[PDB]
């Protein structure tokens, strides 16, 4: 459910895209660097740390989720390497979105999910990234 | 895009992390591996990205190396020493997949290095630069 995702609105937020993302995945970070080059998009990031690969990733995800402005914390970390200093964890949906992503068969990050119900495993660079998101708004 | 689809070499304490989209017949990738041999305390994740149009035998080599019982030993032995498992078998494997992924990512040219901060580098670097660059991109 969208209320279980970090929501970043960029410009008018018109294009929609969701990402199952791991805060310690460099491919996820690179995707966030690309998103920085676009506007007029809402990005919904569902936390999907892959603990087998990234031992600290579930902790980072909960901490980022539980910050006062979780979109600010998410992008600060993914694009800037700024991690909260005294970040606490409260009841959060990370465990649940991690299970869901696995249930959906997403075996790797980032996995993008488009409004038309299609997905893409792995990031794309700009300008392509924008085109693909645009093309999958419908159908 | 998943470490499970990469050849994993741990050198020393394996602290630094770096990944490489690499072609087994690319001398630039081979040189990168010569330089990796000189460094320590680093984990190297090598994703197979043979460029078939340039190196017609590379896809076979990548699949053979992936499919060896110790794929990191086969990879390093070939890239650093020229030792190849001539009788190695090819079974189902992720090379075609990691090849597509590299293309998708817009990588042209091997090696392409990816750092834990999400930044990339086209082409190798010599030691000690290579180590400096890896260390500097452990975080953004």
Automatic annotation (TrEMBL), chain B:
Domain Thioredoxin: 4-139
Main localization (coarse): periplasm
Annotated Gene Ontology cellular component terms: periplasmic space
Domain of life: Bacteria
Keyword set, alphabetical order: Disulfide bond, Periplasm, Redox-active center, Signal
Location of the protein in the cell: Periplasm
Function: Required for disulfide bond formation in some periplasmic proteins. Acts by transferring its disulfide bond to other proteins and is reduced in the process.
Entry similarity comment: Belongs to the thioredoxin family. DsbC subfamily.
Protein's name in the database: Thiol:disulfide interchange protein
Location of this fragment in the whole protein: 126 to 261 of 261
